[PDB]
Amino acid sequence: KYKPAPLATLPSTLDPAEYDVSPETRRAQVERLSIRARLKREYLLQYNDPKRVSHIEDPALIRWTYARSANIYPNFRPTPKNSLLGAVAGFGPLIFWYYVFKTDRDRKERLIQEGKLDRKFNISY
Amino acid sequence: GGVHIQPRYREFPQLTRSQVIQGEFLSSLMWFWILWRFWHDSDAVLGHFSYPDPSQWTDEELGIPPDD
Amino acid sequence: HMTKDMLPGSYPRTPEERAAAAKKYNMRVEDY
Amino acid sequence: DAPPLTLDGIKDRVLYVLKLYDKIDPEKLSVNSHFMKDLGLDSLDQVEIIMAMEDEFGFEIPDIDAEKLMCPQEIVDYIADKKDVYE
Amino acid sequence: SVPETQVSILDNGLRVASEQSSHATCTVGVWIDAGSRYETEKNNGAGYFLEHLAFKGTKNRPGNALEKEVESIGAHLNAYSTREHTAYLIKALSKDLPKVVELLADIVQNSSLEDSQIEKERDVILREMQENDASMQNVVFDYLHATAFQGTPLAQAVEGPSENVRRLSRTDLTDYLNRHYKAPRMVLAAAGGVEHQQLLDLAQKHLSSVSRVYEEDAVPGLTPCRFTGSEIRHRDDALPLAHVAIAVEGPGWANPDNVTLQVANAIILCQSFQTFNISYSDTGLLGAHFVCDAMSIDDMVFFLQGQWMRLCTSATESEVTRGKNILRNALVSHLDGTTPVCEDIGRSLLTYGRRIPLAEWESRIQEVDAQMLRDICSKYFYDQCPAVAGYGPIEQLPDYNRIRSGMFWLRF
Amino acid sequence: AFCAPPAYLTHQQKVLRLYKRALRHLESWCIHRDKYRYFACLMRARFEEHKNEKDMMRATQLLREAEEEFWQNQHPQPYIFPDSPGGTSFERYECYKVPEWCLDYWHPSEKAMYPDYFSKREQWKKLRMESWDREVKQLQEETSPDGIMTEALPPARREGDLPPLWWHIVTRPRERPT
Amino acid sequence: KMELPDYRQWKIEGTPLETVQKKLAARGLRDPWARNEAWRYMGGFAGNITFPSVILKGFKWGFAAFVVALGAEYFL
Amino acid sequence: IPSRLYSLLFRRTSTFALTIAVGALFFERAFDQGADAIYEHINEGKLW
Numbered sequence A: 001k002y003k004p005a006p007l008a009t010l011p012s013t014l015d016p017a018e019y020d021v022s023p024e025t026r027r028a029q030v031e032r033l034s035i036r037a038r039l040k041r042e043y044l045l046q047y048n049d050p051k052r053v054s055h056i057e058d059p060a061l062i063r064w065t066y067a068r069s070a071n072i073y074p075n076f077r078p079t080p081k082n083s084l085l086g087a088v089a090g091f092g093p094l095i096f097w098y099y100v101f102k103t104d105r106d107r108k109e110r111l112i113q114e115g116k117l118d119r120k121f122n123i124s125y
Numbered sequence B: 001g002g003v004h005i006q007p008r009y010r011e012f013p014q015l016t017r018s019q020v021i022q023g024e025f026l027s028s029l030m031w032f033w034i035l036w037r038f039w040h041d042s043d044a045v046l047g048h049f050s051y052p053d054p055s056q057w058t059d060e061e062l063g064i065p066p067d068d
Numbered sequence C: 001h002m003t004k005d006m007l008p009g010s011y012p013r014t015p016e017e018r019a020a021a022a023k024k025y026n027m028r029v030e031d032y
Numbered sequence D: 001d002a003p004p005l006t007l008d009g010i011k012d013r014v015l016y017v018l019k020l021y022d023k024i025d026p027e028k029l030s031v032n033s034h035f036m037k038d039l040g041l042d043s044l045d046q047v048e049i050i051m052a053m054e055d056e057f058g059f060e061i062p063d064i065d066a067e068k069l070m071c072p073q074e075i076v077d078y079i080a081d082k083k084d085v086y087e
Numbered sequence E: 001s002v003p004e005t006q007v008s009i010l011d012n013g014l015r016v017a018s019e020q021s022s023h024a025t026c027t028v029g030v031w032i033d034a035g036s037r038y039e040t041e042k043n044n045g046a047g048y049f050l051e052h053l054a055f056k057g058t059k060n061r062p063g064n065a066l067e068k069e070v071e072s073i074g075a076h077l078n079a080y081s082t083r084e085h086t087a088y089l090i091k092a093l094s095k096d097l098p099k100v101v102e103l104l105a106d107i108v109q110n111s112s113l114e115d116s117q118i119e120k121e122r123d124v125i126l127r128e129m130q131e132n133d134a135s136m137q138n139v140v141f142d143y144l145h146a147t148a149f150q151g152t153p154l155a156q157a158v159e160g161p162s163e164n165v166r167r168l169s170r171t172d173l174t175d176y177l178n179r180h181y182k183a184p185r186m187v188l189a190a191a192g193g194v195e196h197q198q199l200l201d202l203a204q205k206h207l208s209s210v211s212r213v214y215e216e217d218a219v220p221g222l223t224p225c226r227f228t229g230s231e232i233r234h235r236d237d238a239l240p241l242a243h244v245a246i247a248v249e250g251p252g253w254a255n256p257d258n259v260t261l262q263v264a265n266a267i268i269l270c271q272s273f274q275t276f277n278i279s280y281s282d283t284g285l286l287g288a289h290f291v292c293d294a295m296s297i298d299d300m301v302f303f304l305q306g307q308w309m310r311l312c313t314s315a316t317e318s319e320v321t322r323g324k325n326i327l328r329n330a331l332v333s334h335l336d337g338t339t340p341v342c343e344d345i346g347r348s349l350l351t352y353g354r355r356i357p358l359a360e361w362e363s364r365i366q367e368v369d370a371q372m373l374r375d376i377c378s379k380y381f382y383d384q385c386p387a388v389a390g391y392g393p394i395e396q397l398p399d400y401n402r403i404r405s406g407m408f409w410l411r412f
Numbered sequence F: 001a002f003c004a005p006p007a008y009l010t011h012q013q014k015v016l017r018l019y020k021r022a023l024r025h026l027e028s029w030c031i032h033r034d035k036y037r038y039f040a041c042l043m044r045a046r047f048e049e050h051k052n053e054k055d056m057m058r059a060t061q062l063l064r065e066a067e068e069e070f071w072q073n074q075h076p077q078p079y080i081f082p083d084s085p086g087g088t089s090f091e092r093y094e095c096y097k098v099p100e101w102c103l104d105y106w107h108p109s110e111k112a113m114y115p116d117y118f119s120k121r122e123q124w125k126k127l128r129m130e131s132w133d134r135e136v137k138q139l140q141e142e143t144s145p146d147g148i149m150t151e152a153l154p155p156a157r158r159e160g161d162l163p164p165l166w167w168h169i170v171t172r173p174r175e176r177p178t
Numbered sequence G: 001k002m003e004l005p006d007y008r009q010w011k012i013e014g015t016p017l018e019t020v021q022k023k024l025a026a027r028g029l030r031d032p033w034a035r036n037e038a039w040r041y042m043g044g045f046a047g048n049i050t051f052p053s054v055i056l057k058g059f060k061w062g063f064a065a066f067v068v069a070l071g072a073e074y075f076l
Numbered sequence H: 001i002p003s004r005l006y007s008l009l010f011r012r013t014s015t016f017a018l019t020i021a022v023g024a025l026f027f028e029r030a031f032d033q034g035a036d037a038i039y040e041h042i043n044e045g046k047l048w
């Protein structure tokens, strides 16, 4: 049986709902076309309008950008799962690589000090 | 004009003299070359050196001594 | 030209707010 | 490369194919003749017709636009409109 | 050699089934594939409340004049509703066969739901439910269905919650009526002194024109429910006796090992001990219900579980032969009279799609031996999570770990 | 692409649109024409039977098991035409389909040549502005009473009027600017 | 204007469609679109193409040429 | 998956015991071997 994953989702066909539709469902479906038809006949009468120079705005895109870069911090509440996860992300790797670079830089320095690193034909740096 | 090679509907497209001759030409030279080289140089399959049977070398030849 | 009324706001707490937002976003109130 | 279509060469091919479908009589096929109410074919045979046309002219008549290729003529202007033939 | 059950089909899908016999009285009924399983929690009492409203008058026969007609020939009018099927049946004489069919036609279509009646039947239904709680075994079996089929439409009761009962309107009912009363989901079953050709002509005359298509290609499909192993315990220590039901998942209507499971029930300390195999569309509840004093409950449970494990492990040929004989007697003695024969015809056409004759039942009984009985019992009883429903003084009723551990043996 | 999408799909259009995907996904597995024209008239049989089922429930139970039979018996790389969505030439020539409102910013020198072209273009632009009023009014006078509203737009219904909202279905970039 | 071959010309007999036609027929079925798929097998493209034929295209003259050349070398 | 296992060696208690006993019989071999590897290596150069 096809098994939708968050990716490779369940196709339209093979979706239980698409097959058993109640009167309620149909009504809802019909309504959703109305909203779209309505919105469709607003764009079309603003797109096909002679005598227009102004920019059709597509406010649905303006509600999207505002929601995504200027409606974020006004809807921030510091919880757990947010500050624990908001510190593992900023200081986690930043502390990981420090013990990655310190250990390497220290290994290098020791070896140079003791006289093992070859540093041959290296006349540049 | 608009027709350099009349299109055809449900029929075998007519072919120009040149299309057939050039096609047979390239293929025939391929076969002349394969045959010519095979005759002059047949060492493509056979190889001109015969594998020795490693299992027929008198132990003497291989320095195999006789159990001291 | 787009009043804040027509731009995103806070989490719809009461059910009337959950139905007001659904208008802003041109959705069906039962799909928001 | 090939020559462009015409509103009478996109009509002779559409009638041609259909005249080769056994169910559709080849002497009662007239361009203004509906497939399901006048010729007799069923619903499943509309899909089969359209598909022939999609393979005679090499393009796909979308589902929603092809649930209506009823008249044997709609097919002749829809194909042409989709291919920009102003005759 | 019983007169075979002959089945015809109208265009609409109304299967007209009949089983002729010499008796002069007949049981003509209509069976509809519509129950509480097809309800969507917003109309949870629509079938029950329509079953109350269906005898209170139609458009052609307004009010009690309708039931005056079924008094006039001395016929009996009954209806019932389960989680999957609804039945409207009439017991009458043979010579009154046409008008009865016409009466049934009104009851399924052209029915009239009076708003006045709706309030009166709401008070009837509400009150009955308010007193239905009195019947314990009904409470225990409803609890067992709820805890075994949690989150599915098979948990909800036939009557529905008082809430919906109060909150129901003609239009809603109209919907359930117009949605779940389709002609292909309907069987007109007749048993007794009826002729099949006359009944077919009467079904063609009345009861054609029953809807066969949904409002908006809104086909109401069904999804196999999910059995859930769990234990619901309603404790009320003032009751004198305790009722406990323990069940596992059943196979369904179409699975033949049901027959074998029935033999197992025929093989099986509490004042009352009853075994059940309730079957729905590819699901069911197979188990036991016992009603006992508090201080015995745990011992009963232990007893009962031992018997199940014995049927999974140590079934012998003599008890299998006894269970086969008990099942043969049960089937033939149940198929006696026009009403149970008509009931069997309606359920057989709704569930199996055909009337299984008694010879096929006898063949499926005689092919059952001890080895396949303990195999099927190990398939359905051994190491399975049960659903437990208790009501009464049920403190000594063991919790779920002890019952689950009693569902298997350490010695096999 | 031309006609508008229906809100919900019927039973039929779902069945009859499988007959297409199915038969067309049978010509990937069965490439040769003969094998196909054989293995396919056998397909219709499958759809031909179970045609007159009146029991909707059943019908929607044959359909739901057909589309799962199909999903598991489909070809990974079917034959999708060259110019159709998902194809090999889909939207290839779109780099040459400029939107025609761009010939309005041409330098008077450029439009100097190609002159009769712009003489006819100015006629059509007069047609467009000459009817926007009668059109929008039509679109509105004939707007549906409150309720179901689909994306279907009305025809003309009067002489001289032009089908409402016709400037972008006509004046649409040529399919293959070549 | 381009003409089009007479629709009648096409017939299923004489082509692999005919054998498909006869079996589907045993099943009682009959495919109605065969004739359309006839020109595939009808003419020009009617001959079966064998795999050696393609690999060996032009071999006849190629070897002929091989002979001639070897000959010239023999003639020195 | 485990299903196959369960239905075969983990559902019948007798078999449950069988799988346990047999596994334990071999586990010791593996555990001792693996454990020793760990301990000895930790102290390699000091043993004997």
Ligand SMILES: CCCCCCCCCCCCCCCCCC(=O)OC[C@H](COP(=O)(O)OCCN)OC(=O)CCCCCCCCCCCCCCCCC
Pocket: A088, A092, A093, A096, A099, A100, A103, A104, A105, A107
């Ligand atoms: C993407 C390709 C990655 C390819 C990696 C290739 C690795 C090559 C082998 C590296 C390890 C052996 C090196 C031997 C010679 C160098 C010896 C040396 O001086 O390296 C020391 C360094 C120590 O690192 P660590 O193990 O953290 O030690 C911390 C001790 N307290 O030793 C190490 O750094 C060990 C870890 C090496 C790899 C580090 C991670 C590389 C990829 C990082 C991607 C981004 C990760 C972000 C993580 C965020 C976490 C919140």
